[PDB]
Amino acid sequence: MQPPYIQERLKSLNDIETQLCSMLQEASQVTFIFGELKRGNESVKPQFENHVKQFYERLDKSTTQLRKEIQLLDENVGTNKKALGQDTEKMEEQLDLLSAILDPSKSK
Amino acid sequence: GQALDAVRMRLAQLTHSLRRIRDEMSKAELPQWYTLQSQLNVTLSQLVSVTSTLQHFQETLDSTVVYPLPKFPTTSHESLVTTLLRKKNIPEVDEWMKYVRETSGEEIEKLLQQDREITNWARTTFRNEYGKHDFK
């Protein structure tokens, strides 16, 4: 499996696009609510401020976190290799098989 | 005549752009999406410029009075004259805004001022929201 650092990096990226999807959804609801606000019912007027504020705060911190990720790219620089040992490990397992062949009491 | 000349040249280039987008859509194979977007945006902004310039010079167009040429023969070209003379809209747009008005349907004036205050309030609210977070 990959080293953990890459794991939380990909988790943060996934959070980033989920936040973008949430921003698009909230844009959909604010566009929806503005229609009836133009229609002329004032009951949903208080919800408009909350929706706008949450939309803007969702737009800002997502870009901020993505900026942090791109910054991490800046200092992460400088921080078949398996083949060099690959034959060796193959060697090992083959002899292990011979051991299983060599002992008739373990072939069950 | 200067205003109508500018209208002429701009509408001619708009028609040229329409002919362009036409003969690149008429091909049996659709080009790349990006070229279509570029053509769409260019032609559509050109239509915007057409609308704005036609708006600017309404007085010159209105002042002009239409009259057929003495040399132009109407006996043989009456069909051509009637073709340009007619101005009634295409019917589908007509019932289109008829259904639109049907759906839409001192009271009207005070709703109008209520819309004014909602517009101003929303503009101020979004100005405040933009000012809340530093975007630079």
Swiss-Prot record, chain A:
Component of the Mediator complex, a coactivator involved in the regulated transcription of nearly all RNA polymerase II-dependent genes. Mediator functions as a bridge to convey information from gene-specific regulatory proteins to the basal RNA polymerase II transcription machinery. The Mediator complex, having a compact conformation in its free form, is recruited to promoters by direct interactions with regulatory proteins and serves for the assembly of a functional pre-initiation complex (PIC) with RNA polymerase II and the general transcription factors. One of its GO terms (cellular component) is mediator complex. Changing residue 24 to K: Results in a decrease of TFIIK and RNA polymerase II occupancies at active promoters. Residues 56-100 form a coiled coil. Keywords: Activator, Coiled coil, Nucleus, Transcription, Transcription regulation. The gene is MED11. GO terms for biological process: negative regulation of transcription by RNA polymerase II; positive regulation of transcription by RNA polymerase II; positive regulation of transcription elongation by RNA polymerase II; positive regulation of transcription initiation by RNA polymerase II; RNA polymerase II preinitiation complex assembly. This is Mediator of RNA polymerase II transcription subunit 11. It comes from Saccharomyces cerevisiae (strain ATCC 204508 / S288c). Present with 396 molecules/cell in log phase SD medium. The keyword Coiled coil applies. It holds the Pfam family Med11. It is found in: Nucleus. Belongs to the mediator complex subunit 11 family. GO terms for molecular function: TFIIH-class transcription factor complex binding; transcription coactivator activity. Component of the Mediator complex, which is composed of at least 21 subunits that form three structurally distinct submodules. The Mediator head module contains MED6, MED8, MED11, SRB4/MED17, SRB5/MED18, ROX3/MED19, SRB2/MED20 and SRB6/MED22, the middle module contains MED1, MED4, NUT1/MED5, MED7, CSE2/MED9, NUT2/MED10, SRB7/MED21 and SOH1/MED31, and the tail module contains MED2, PGD1/MED3, RGR1/MED14, GAL11/MED15 and SIN4/MED16. The head and the middle modules interact directly with RNA polymerase II, whereas the elongated tail module interacts with gene-specific regulatory proteins. The keyword DNA-binding does not apply. It comes from the Eukaryota.
UniProtKB/Swiss-Prot annotation, chain B:
Its main location: nucleus. Keywords: Activator, Coiled coil, DNA-binding, Nucleus, Transcription, Transcription regulation. GO terms for cellular component: core mediator complex; mediator complex; nucleus. Component of the Mediator complex, which is composed of at least 21 subunits that form three structurally distinct submodules. The Mediator head module contains MED6, MED8, MED11, SRB4/MED17, SRB5/MED18, ROX3/MED19, SRB2/MED20 and SRB6/MED22, the middle module contains MED1, MED4, NUT1/MED5, MED7, CSE2/MED9, NUT2/MED10, SRB7/MED21 and SOH1/MED31, and the tail module contains MED2, PGD1/MED3, RGR1/MED14, GAL11/MED15 and SIN4/MED16. The head and the middle modules interact directly with RNA polymerase II, whereas the elongated tail module interacts with gene-specific regulatory proteins. Present with 937 molecules/cell in log phase SD medium. Belongs to the Mediator complex subunit 8 family. This is Mediator of RNA polymerase II transcription subunit 8. It comes from Saccharomyces cerevisiae (strain ATCC 204508 / S288c) (Baker's yeast). The chain holds residues 30 to 173 of 223 of the full protein.
